[PDB]
């Protein structure tokens with residue numbers, strides 16, 4: 001149970017690596033003593049980790065009941081506008097901040113110190129958020145709704161903002177009755193307002209992502225892939 | 240007119256572009272403010288912008304005083320000014336500041352404590368004060384600095400209509416600087432100074448990032464000419 005809750009759960013679990021398909025062939029806890037200060041390699045990896053999730057988040061979104069029923073312009077705006085947030089949220093939930101382990105959606109496992117030069121201090125902020133997310137001890141169905149709710153949310157330029165809002169309300173309702181379905185002791189709506197407290201912090205983290213990309217576009221060692229670029233420019237709110 | 244003529248003009252342009260020890264404005268200064276670090280409100284951001292704008296109006300009038308500059312084409316004067324503004328704002332602020340006391344001293348005469356700049360400027364201001372210490376330790380005298388800042392401005396820029404008249408004027412100020420440093424008694428102070436250029440370069444980048452961040456945040460609109468400088472400098476636009 002139940003039918004919305006189970007589709008979400010399935011779309012979530014299907015959009016990422018099983019425990020058995022994790023790839024450690026690249027993971028090095030020891031690296032340094034060095035920097036890039038930015039090397040091409042760092043930057044090209046940063047961007048490749050980013051692009052990797054694109055196709056994955058896009059197929060995940062399609063399995064959300066109702067998402068395929070929004071206008072195609074609305075589907076593309078939600079996806080573009082939520083991309084960085086979904087990338088951070090899913091990374092944060094997937095990773096293991098106690099050990100400094102980042103686990104990407106391909107299955108690829110990397111150490112923080114392997115990510116540092118590419119992501120800059122951003123990786124540290126993501127890790128902090130992941131530490132905080134972990135201690136909320138959020139279950140899979142709660143997570144399945146939370147990420148869906150990051151995607152399905154009001155955005156400037158929506159064609160059918162009311163239909164996006166009814167789809168979001170179904171999801172929030174599903175969430176609310178699921179975290180109340182674990183009743184004793186909590187049943188609180190404290191659990192709830194704590195998990196929902198994680199969305200603004202996420203938006204703040206996304207801004208830090210846009211900051212890193214601005215910085216890398218500035219130095220121009222290696223251009224972003226056009227779809228990341230398009231999201232950067234389509235979502236920077238300023239002729 | 241008819242001592243030291245180009246040099247005299249440079250010094251005189253320099254000195255009239257900034258405050259006398261007597262004209263320092265302690266009216267907003269507080270030796271201790273307790274800021275909420277990492278965040279900023281509209282008065283913070285507006286002061287940051289005003290500080291940038293007033294600096295550019297002042298750099299404009301100083302430039303009008305460099306012999307030859309005001310006879311460059313209008314578009315050339317604009318382009319030189321817009322292209323060097325961040326460099327000049329950082330170099331001039333660091334040169335007159337008092338980092339041993341956490342004091343930023345702007346061209347208008349406004350004195351502000353590092354703590355007071357934290358919210359508008361973010362980390363950038365701390366890094367500018369590092370460059371102040373770095374600059375101050377080279378003991379660049381005022382006539383050397385008059386020539387140096389002027390050479391930051393007068394330099395090749397892509398899109399000049401009259402690049403050779405700019406290079407002609409660049410040659411004039413270099414010969415002028417050389418005469419001066421030879422009149423005041425290998426890898427030289429200038430070589431040493433050129434060695435600080437990467438610091439200045441990074442501080443300009445850090446300025447461009449702070450402005451990006453604040454535009455993203457959008458508490459208040461930026462001044463048009465500052466916004467145009469930010470936008471013109473982006474190599475991807």
Ligand SMILES: CCCCCCCC(=O)c1cc(OC)c(OC)c(OC)c1CC(=O)OCC
Pocket residue numbers: 253254257258259260331334335336344374375376377378379380381
């Ligand atoms: C390489 C750095 C060495 C340390 C010197 C620091 C610069 C300085 O405080 C200074 C000292 C002067 O007197 C010697 C002077 O001329 C009157 C001068 O120009 C206005 C300045 C510069 C200035 O920007 O102040 C105006 C408010």
Ligand SMILES: CCCCCCCC(=O)c1cc(OC)c(OC)c(OC)c1CC(=O)OCC
Pocket residue numbers: 320321322323324325326327439440441442443444447468469470471472473474
């Ligand atoms: C044209 C593309 C060049 C990109 C390089 C970084 C641009 C920058 O930081 C900058 C931007 C400006 O305008 C935004 C500007 O004038 C205010 C300025 O003063 C020299 C600098 C400083 C500078 O160019 O030297 C250190 C980097």
Ligand code: NA
Pocket residue numbers: 053056057086087090091105
């Ligand atoms: Na992902």
